[PDB]
């Protein structure tokens, strides 16, 4: 995250752990 951040740029899997339940 941000979802834009991964797409337009680069993001770690760790930043994805932020959108989990």
């Amino acid at each position: 995250g941000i979802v834009e951040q991964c797409c337009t740029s680069c993001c770690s899997l760790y930043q994805l752990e932020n959108y989990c339940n």
Side-chain angles (χ1 to χ4, degrees):
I2 191 180
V3 153
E4 287 53 73
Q5 135 98 295
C6 300
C7 198
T8 85
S9 208
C10 296
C11 77
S12 63
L13 301 182
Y14 289 96
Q15 306 185 286
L16 297 185
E17 239 201 342
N18 314 12
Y19 298 103
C20 298
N21 272 253

